[PDB]
Enzyme design. Sequence first.
Site, PDB file in Angstrom:
ATOM      1  N   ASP A 208     -37.522  30.612 103.593  1.00 26.12           N
ATOM      2  CA  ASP A 208     -38.692  31.228 102.966  1.00 26.12           C
ATOM      3  C   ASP A 208     -39.190  30.328 101.846  1.00 26.12           C
ATOM      4  O   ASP A 208     -38.373  29.816 101.065  1.00 26.12           O
ATOM      5  CB  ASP A 208     -38.323  32.576 102.365  1.00 26.12           C
ATOM      6  CG  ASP A 208     -38.099  33.669 103.375  1.00 26.12           C
ATOM      7  OD1 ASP A 208     -38.317  33.455 104.582  1.00 26.12           O
ATOM      8  OD2 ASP A 208     -37.724  34.794 102.912  1.00 26.12           O
TER       9      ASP A 208
ATOM     10  N   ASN B 196     -42.037  32.720 105.673  1.00 23.35           N
ATOM     11  CA  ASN B 196     -40.909  32.342 106.530  1.00 23.35           C
ATOM     12  C   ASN B 196     -41.258  31.351 107.619  1.00 23.35           C
ATOM     13  O   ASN B 196     -42.194  31.570 108.370  1.00 23.35           O
ATOM     14  CB  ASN B 196     -40.368  33.638 107.152  1.00 23.35           C
ATOM     15  CG  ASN B 196     -38.999  33.499 107.784  1.00 23.35           C
ATOM     16  OD1 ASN B 196     -38.631  32.475 108.225  1.00 23.35           O
ATOM     17  ND2 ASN B 196     -38.287  34.598 107.896  1.00 23.35           N
TER      18      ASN B 196
ATOM     19  N   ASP C 247     -51.310  41.311 110.479  1.00 22.65           N
ATOM     20  CA  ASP C 247     -50.700  41.200 111.817  1.00 22.65           C
ATOM     21  C   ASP C 247     -50.093  42.477 112.385  1.00 22.65           C
ATOM     22  O   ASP C 247     -49.510  42.443 113.472  1.00 22.65           O
ATOM     23  CB  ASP C 247     -49.660  40.070 111.827  1.00 22.65           C
ATOM     24  CG  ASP C 247     -48.290  40.503 111.325  1.00 22.65           C
ATOM     25  OD1 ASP C 247     -48.126  41.659 110.861  1.00 22.65           O
ATOM     26  OD2 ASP C 247     -47.367  39.670 111.399  1.00 22.65           O
TER      27      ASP C 247
END
Length: 129
Positions: A52, A59, A101
């Site tokens: 990350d 990520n 998303d």
Amino acid sequence: KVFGRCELAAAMKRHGLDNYRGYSLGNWVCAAKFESNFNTQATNRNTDGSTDYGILQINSRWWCNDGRTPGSRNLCNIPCSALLSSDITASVNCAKKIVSDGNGMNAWVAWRNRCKGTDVQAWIRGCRL
């Protein structure tokens, strides 16, 4: 760069994060606090071998290329190192894709566990926005 709290709030607002996908500015500042402690250079390895990166701990399993995360995607089409810059543009642009998303800010473990359902407006209290 270690941002100040209000300094980061102002940069995030300038880049269009305030109410982006319905998440108020304090959600973003809170997420950054507990992901990176406002440090653009923060990096943390995950158990799966991904890493990350940056202020929002994006990520490498899906979002950026670090050259050492097998089988991963690079959905933001950037080197992961671009997420470590003092200029937060790349982090913000990638964060916009992430939050759009389907799972929203639940993508960010620190947001889910430390910010969600709390008084996130406290994170921008006092800032000249």
